[PDB]
Design a protein around this ligand. Structure first.
Ligand SMILES: [Zn+2]
Ligand SMILES: [Zn+2]
Ligand SMILES: [Zn+2]
Lengths: 63, 115, 50, 67, 1131, 101, 46
RNA sequence: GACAGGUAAGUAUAGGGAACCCACU
């Protein structure tokens, strides 16, 4: 969907196991918006995955 | 696509004579035995036995074509003797050879087994 | 080879038999000869056809 | 791709020898020693073992068309 | 510290191992493409002049920088997708990445009001991406990653994928640009001709070729005249100089000659002065040139302006194009004239056109750069037109709408698909051949194809001179590998260690020279030239020097230290002349060589050990190059290099031959190429047999790629039981023949047996064939797609039924499924529908367009794949596999130019046998060897027996003194065998010993793709061509054989008139016509009503039936179209 | 003269769009020029444009007979692929005479 | 009628109908393969 | 209304071309 400036895979603090969700930072905001609609529902390694803009620091009152 | 079936080598096709006899008009007491679905094994053993036979002025075999599985055996005997009789006696003697060799081999195998 | 060398080896004389094998220079020169032959064939074919 | 079942020339079974040959090789036997241990006297069978290239592992490196 | 010879063998081979680990085999392709993408695209974009328009409002529209994404693919929803290279192969996509640029449009209308706006990442097209290149998505992927992606790790890449077809760019030879070559052409009106194909670093303008000829003797003397670009006449050289602004003959001779003490030169040039005397003024000369111009301008002013433009821009562009470059241009022209004079007087040898050092190899880099330059010019022109047309009405425009990415994208796709290197409309004018379909028959074939070279001379040429192998090709090109057909000698291959420079900027070199004592050309005076040493950089004479020896020492030190001069750069000092030429051009071939100082290699045991431990310490070939033990050398530098086979030459001798060596071969065997390398003991064969093997290897069947199981390649062959040869050259370790062998080691007896192997035929063991000997599988991929081009007419896959669809053959469609597709694991015969397809008509409303299995073919459906093509249409590929058991007529070949067809197969009991049960897998007539000189074949058989008995792999590296026939024979005897390999064999039929003792042993054989089943063909009244009713062509169409002209002539000689008549008339295209007896023209014959009429004569009774060939009827009709009356007098 | 369809056969395509012969296309061009000139004659037109139409018609007919006259431009079917004149059909090897008779 | 195809990427079975655009319902991957036929198949071991 | 079972009536079980390239004898 666009070049990725940085990729972050979250891990368990104590167990170290993979959390199962990551944050991807694209070079351009448009590449992200282009991915918002298409990425949702993708299948990676046989398991369906969902994709939505991270609202943790965008949507007011999100937790 | 044109490869002949393997069994064709030894399986007589429907209505095939296993053996056919002709008289070689060139010289007397001479017969040609055309044997189908046979090869150098039988040809050579029979030729050797007939050559051993003294009355046989002529005995031999050939394969007209390797791609074909037919052999021709030419046998000429003395006037007082028949190529057919010579052929039959040669086969009989080879059969006796095989029987004797079989029983002797059985004895030897047994004896080796005991020690 | 040194410059201005007109010796057999320098100018491409194969002093070794096929069984003995060929030193690299001799092998190269023999390849040149074979190439000459092949080219002659590939051209004479058309010339003679015409 | 896989070790042939029979020696092409003589027909001696060799298909049941590839794993043992590899085991000996990793056991540090020379190739000739391994062949002798397996009993491959005729150089036809010795060829069958020496020249073989087991491509089947490289083939298996790929995932199957079906899960 | 040193390396004793015993150690030296292993040391050199370790060095080669490290080299190949570092570089790979298609390094030249990958590097050329990477350099292209990285530098050349941006260079072209910047060089492109900004477009300004006037309706008043004026626009700038300047391009700034390029940004290239990775290969991406969009569906209908707009979702970009990562096209697996495998995905592109499967779906017939094109592996290309979108390209982008930054554009700045500034508008000025009045009051210098700047409207500078910038549009960033403007999409402008797509660029196909060479696989495994830097920018390919497979770059730097681990072998595990490639296996996951279904990509053979051993696959070298170096090719593009256009619509799912693999394409490879063949390097194209050409005369090196920016050089002075003097050729003697007595055939022409010129005794000699200097020539320079000047060409700036990067320029849409093609190379400007300038000639300077000396007229053949016979008014009084001989005159020198130059032919310039855009001028249809030669010009006196003195006139050219005066136009450049040099009237003083003293100055002109200072520029041309450098030692005025040479009355020879000076007298020889006098006649040119005599010819060109009246014109004494630069303006007069410029007017003269303008008049000589193609379209001289009536005005003398405009003539002079045109001439000045031509001189400044079109003449010696690489020297300069800007004003004030007149001094440099004059000096270079004088140097060219000086070269011509030297050649004319014989003081300097003529340059050899075929001398390979005078050639350059346009790899994928330069070729794509040229194509992209043209295409970018077209895009800029189109944008200019669009913007101009909109601004003409005062209204503005959108640069985004102006841009037509299709220009670039479609042009690149078309060029790389059709190989026609040029504009699509100029197909004929372009040169085809480039961008061939990658040959995937085997790994060896693929490698050779990727390393292929082509000479653009043209196959029609009958001149053996260019075709001949040349001395310069040593170590640069494989001397053996070359097509034996009409293209012999024209198509080549790279030697293993060969490598092609990608080029580099000479700016750092020029800066270093300026820092150095080098003196600028303009700065110096003419006098100093005579004794000084000229310095050229890519043909640009920059200046002179006074201590060339130490200067060259400094340059070599710098290159070895890798400080300012990259390895690719070449430096040559023509000591006999006074020139030092430095080349950083791309396309200059080059090979590594071990450096020698005094009489000792710079390589050392410590280097060897570090290389041995390369895995851990990470020491590498690059580290060797940096340390400066090894050095790259091109052909021009080779001309001066003095080189040694091996350290043995360095070893002191009673009569030192050279004692002044400078380099040493890494190993002589490296001079061979990919295909030639697999040959064991090539140095024991007649060279033409090595040449033949170079191609038969390409044909051998094996495992062409590890991941074949997924690739739906159009045609493929896979051997059941490949085997690495028992006898191996060390070089195949890097060809990876071990990983992907193509052939089987087979016990071969070189004996006469039943005569069925005579004349290059071979008997084969039927029992071995049954046991799987040389059994193979042949995969054929069919493809189809359902097109919805029009609502009126559309195609669909389905299982059609006779009641609905009409165009059905009698073939059964039951094998198909409800989707009009056959399923895997289904037996299939020829002319058997496999893809039931139908089309909606404008037995009703449906016409059959199904795809049947190729006639006479058979097999089982390996697998089926269904996708959507670029336009969403359903698109199905079916791979069908047929098991080919070797049989009579199938082609086999050793590695020694010995090929033959299987004459007959004898079961094991029939085959002859040793005292042991061993029987030969193959028997080959001894009559091959005598004339063929394939002694390498026999040696291979012997050493193969030795190695098989010993439990090792024989080493048949060509130039290996440690191995010889006597040693091999002694070893063989040690294993209880006859020392020469002979054996006592028994006739299989009778058991009797054979009076002779048969040579027998293992030998690597390989089964070539050409099988009798794919060539057998016959016809009896099949389909016929439409234009003429003669039999169709080609067995795929059930065609008929061509009874050609020489066959006609042979029958004529036989006198078989009736047979000739049958062959040419009654069996080809019998026809009947009616002819007016009066005018002798075909007449209208309604046979139903028996109404025969000739309009011209208006008669009806005097008409005669005439039997003639339909081709003859067509010829007569065509003549009458040409308005000829081939009247037909039956009387 | 106008050769019949058999001489310049049109092939029914996999798509419904029939594909016309090279001679057919050349004849179409000639007919177009002929009709244009006939119109420019039946209605008064500048002698210059009449001459230009005559020149173009001459070129088209000459190319139809032979599409290889040196100097002249080559008749170009589409996408820059030259036509095949009758002279080329009959010219040499692979022609009607040597290739088919 | 069912027409089960195996997706290339996820190797998942899925029905496909005629005129249905080819795309794995599971992963949106556009490459599929027909499943091995059920017809009786035999091979003499020659 | 839906859905599961049975009876009756009707339907369904003619062929390309060119160009180019590669390879072959
Ligand atoms: Zn064996
Ligand atoms: Zn008439
Ligand atoms: Zn899927």
């Amino acid at each position: 969907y666009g070049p990725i400036k940085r990729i972050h895979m979250v891990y368990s603090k104590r167990s170290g196991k993979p959390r199962g969700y990551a944050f991807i930072e694209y070079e351009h905001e448009r590449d992200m918006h282009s991915a918002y609609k298409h990425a949702d529902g993708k299948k990676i390694d046989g398991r369906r995955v969902l994709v939505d803009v991270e609202r943790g620091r965008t949507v007011k009152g999100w937790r | 696509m044109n490869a002949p079936p393997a069994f064709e080598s030894f399986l007589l096709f429907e209505g095939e004579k296993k053996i056919t006899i002709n008289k070689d008009t060139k010289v007397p007491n001479a017969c040609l035995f055309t044997i189908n679905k046979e090869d150098h094994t039988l040809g050579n053993i029979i030729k050797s036995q007939l050559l051993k036979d003294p009355q046989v002025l002529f005995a031999g075999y050939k394969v007209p074509h390797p791609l074909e599985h037919k052999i021709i055996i030419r046998v000429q005997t003395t006037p007082d003797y028949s190529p057919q009789e010579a052929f039959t006696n040669a086969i009989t003697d080879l059969i006796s050879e095989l029987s004797l060799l079989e029983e002797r081999f059985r004895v030897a195998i047994k004896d080796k087994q005991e020690g | 080879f040194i410059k201005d060398d007109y010796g057999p080896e320098s100018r491409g004389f194969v002093e070794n038999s096929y069984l003995a094998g060929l030193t690299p220079t001799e092998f190269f020169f023999h390849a040149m000869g074979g190439r000459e032959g092949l080219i002659d064939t590939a051209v004479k074919t058309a010339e003679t056809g015409y | 791709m896989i070790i042939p079942v029979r020696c092409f020339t003589c027909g001696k079974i060799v298909g049941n020898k590839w794993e043992a040959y590899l085991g000996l090789l990793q056991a540090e036997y020379t190739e000739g020693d391994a062949l002798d241990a397996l009993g491959l006297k005729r150089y036809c069978c010795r060829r069958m073992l020496l020249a073989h290239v087991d491509l089947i592992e490289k083939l298996l490196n790929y995932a199957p068309l079906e899960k | 510290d040193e390396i004793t010879p015993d150690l030296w063998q292993e040391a050199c081979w370790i060095v080669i191992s490290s080299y190949f680990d570092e570089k790979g085999l298609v390094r030249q392709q990958l590097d050329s493409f990477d350099e292209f993408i990285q530098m050349s695209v941006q260079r072209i974009v910047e060089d492109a002049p900004p477009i300004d328009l006037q309706a008043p409002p004026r626009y700038l529209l300047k391009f700034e920088q390029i940004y290239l994404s990775k290969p991406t693919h969009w569906e209908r929803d707009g979702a970009p997708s990562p096209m697996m290279p495998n995905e592109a192969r499967l779906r017939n996509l094109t592996y290309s990445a979108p390209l982008y640029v930054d554009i700045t449009k500034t508008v000025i209308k009045e009051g210098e009001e700047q409207l500078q706006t910038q549009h960033q990442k403007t999409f402008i097209g797509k660029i196909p991406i060479m696989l495994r290149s830097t920018y390919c998505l497979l770059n730097g992927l681990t072998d595990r990653d490639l296996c996951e992606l279904n990509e053979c790790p051993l696959d070298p890449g170096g090719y593009f994928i256009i619509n799912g077809s693999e394409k490879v760019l063949i390097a194209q030879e050409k005369m090196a640009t920016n050089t002075v070559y003097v050729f003697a052409k007595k055939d022409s009106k010129y005794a000699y001709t200097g020539e320079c194909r000047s060409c700036l670093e990067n320029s849409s303008r093609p190379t400007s070729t300038i000639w300077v000829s000396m007229l053949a003797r016979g008014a009084i003397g001989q005159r020198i005249v130059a032919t310039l670009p855009y001028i249809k006449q030669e010009v006196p050289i003195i006139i050219v100089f005066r136009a450049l602004g040099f009237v003083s003959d003293r100055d002109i001779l200072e520029h041309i000659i450098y030692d005025f003490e040479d009355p020879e030169m000076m007298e020889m040039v006098k006649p040119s002065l005599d010819e060109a005397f009246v014109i004494q003024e630069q303006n007069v000369a410029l007017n003269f040139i303008g008049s000589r111009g193609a379209k001289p301008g009536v005005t003398k002013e405009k003539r002079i302006k045109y001439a000045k433009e031509v001189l400044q821009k079109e003449m010696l562009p690489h020297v300069g194009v800007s004003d004030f470059c007149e001094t440099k241009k004059a000096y270079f022209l004088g140097y060219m004239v000086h070269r011509l004079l030297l050649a004319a007087l014989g003081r300097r040898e003529l340059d050899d056109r075929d001398h390979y050092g005078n050639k350059r190899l346009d790899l994928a880099g330069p070729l794509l750069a040229f194509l992209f330059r043209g295409m970018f010019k077209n895009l800029l022109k189109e944008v200019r037109i669009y913007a101009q047309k909109f601004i003409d009405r005062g209204k503005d425009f959108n640069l985004e709408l102006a841009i037509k990415t299709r220009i670039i994208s479609d042009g690149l796709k078309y060029s790389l698909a059709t190989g026609n290197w040029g504009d699509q409309k100029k197909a004929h004018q372009a040169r085809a051949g480039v961008s061939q379909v990658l040959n995937r028959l085997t790994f060896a074939s693929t490698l050779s194809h990727l390393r292929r070279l082509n000479s653009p001379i043209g196959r029609d040429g009958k001149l053996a001179k260019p075709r001949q192998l040349h001395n310069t090709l040593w170590g640069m090109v494989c001397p053996a590998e070359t097509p034996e057909g009409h293209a012999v000698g024209l198509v080549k291959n790279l030697a293993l260690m060969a490598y092609i420079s990608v080029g580099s900027q000479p700016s750092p070199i020029l800066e270093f020279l300026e820092e150095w004592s080098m003196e600028n050309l303009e700065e110096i005076s003419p006098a100093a030239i005579a004794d000084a040493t000229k310095i050229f950089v890519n043909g640009c004479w920059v200046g002179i020097h006074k201590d060339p020896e130490q200067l060259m020492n400094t340059l070599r030190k710098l290159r070895r230290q890798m400080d300012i001069i990259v390895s690719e750069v070449s430096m040559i000092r023509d000591i006999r002349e006074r020139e030092i030429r430095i080349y950083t051009d791309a396309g200059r071939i080059c090979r590594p060589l071990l450096i020698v100082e005094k009489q000792k290699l710079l390589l050392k045991k410590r280097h060897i050990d570090q290389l041995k431990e390369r895995e851990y310490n990470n020491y590498s070939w690059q580290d060797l190059v940096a340390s400066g033990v090894v050095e790259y050398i091109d052909t021009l530098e080779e001309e001066t290099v003095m080189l040694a086979m091996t350290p043995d030459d360095l070893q002191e001798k009673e009569v030192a031959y050279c004692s002044t060596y400078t380099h040493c071969e890494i190993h002589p065997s490296m001079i061979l190429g990919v295909c030639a390398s697999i040959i064991p003991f090539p140095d024991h064969n007649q060279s033409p047999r090595n040449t033949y093997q170079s191609a038969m290897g390409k044909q051998a069947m094996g495992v062409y790629i590890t991941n074949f199981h997924v690739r739906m390649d159009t045609l493929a062959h896979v051997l059941y039981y490949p085997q690495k040869p028992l006898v191996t050259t060390r070089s195949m370790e890097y060809l990876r023949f071990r990983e992907l062998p193509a052939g089987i080691n087979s016990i071969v007896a070189i004996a006469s047996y039943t005569g069925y192997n005579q004349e290059d035929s071979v008997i084969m063991n039927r029992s071995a064939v049954d046991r799987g000997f040389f059994r193979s599988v042949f995969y054929r991929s069919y493809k189809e797609q359902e097109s919805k081009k029009g609502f009126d007419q559309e195609e669909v896959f389905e299982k059609p039924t006779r009641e609905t669809c009409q165009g059905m053959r009698h073939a059964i469609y039951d094998k198909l499924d409800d989707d009009g597709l056959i399923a895997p694991g289904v037996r299939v015969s020829g002319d058997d529908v496999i893809i039931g397809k139908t089309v909606t008509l404008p037995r009703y409303t449906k016409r059959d367009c199904s795809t049947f299995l190729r006639t006479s073919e058979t097999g089982i459906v390996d697998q089926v794949m269904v996708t959507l093509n670029q336009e969403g249409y359903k698109f199905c590929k079916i791979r069908v596999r047929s098991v080919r058991i070797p049989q009579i007529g199938d082609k086999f070949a050793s590695r020694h130019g010995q090929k033959g067809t299987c004459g007959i197969q004898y079961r094991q009991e029939d085959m002859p046998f040793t005292c042991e049960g061993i029987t030969p897998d193959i028997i080959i007539n001894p009559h091959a060897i005598p004339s063929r000189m394939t002694i390498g074949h026999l040696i291979e058989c012997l050493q193969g027996k030795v190695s098989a008995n010993k439990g090792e792999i024989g080493d048949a590296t060509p130039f290996n003194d440690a191995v010889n026939v006597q040693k091999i024979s002694n070893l063989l005897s040690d294993y209880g065998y006859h020392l020469r390999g002979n054996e006592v064999l028994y006739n299989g039929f009778t058991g009797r010993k054979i009076t002779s003792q048969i040579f027998i042993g293992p030998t690597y054989y390989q089964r070539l793709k050409h099988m009798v089943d794919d060539k057998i063909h016959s016809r009896a009244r099949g389909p016929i061509q439409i234009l003429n009713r003669q039999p169709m062509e080609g067995r795929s169409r059930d065609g008929g054989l061509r009874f050609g002209e020489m066959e006609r002539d042979c029958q004529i000689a036989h006198g078989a008139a009736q047979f000739l008549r049958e062959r040419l008339f009654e069996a080809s295209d019998p026809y009947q016509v009616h002819v007016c007896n009066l005018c002798g023209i075909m007449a209208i014959a309604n046979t139903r009503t028996h109404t025969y009429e000739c309009r011209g004569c208006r008669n009806k009774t005097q008409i005669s039936l005439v039997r003639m060939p339909y081709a003859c009827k067509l010829l007569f009709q065509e003549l009458m179209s040409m308005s000829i009356a081939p009247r037909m007098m039956s009387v | 003269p106008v050769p019949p369809l058999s001489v310049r056969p049109a092939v029914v395509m996999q798509g419904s769009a029939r594909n016309q012969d090279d001679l057919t296309h050349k004849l179409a061009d000639i007919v177009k020029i002929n009709n244009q000139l006939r119109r420019n004659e039946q209605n008064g037109a500048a002698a210059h444009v009449i001459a230009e139409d005559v020149k173009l018609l001459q070129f088209h007919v000459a190319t139809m007979v032979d599409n290889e006259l040196p100097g002249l431009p080559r008749a170009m079917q589409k996408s820059g692929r030259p036509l095949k004149s009758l002279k080329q059909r009959l010219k040499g090897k692979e022609g009607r005479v040597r290739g088919n008779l | 009628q069912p027409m089960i195809y195996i997706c290339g990427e996820c190797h998942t079975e899925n029905e496909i109908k005629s005129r249905d655009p080819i795309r794995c319902r599971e992963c949106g991957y556009r490459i599929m393969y027909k499943k091995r036929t059920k017809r009786l198949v035999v091979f003499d071991a020659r």
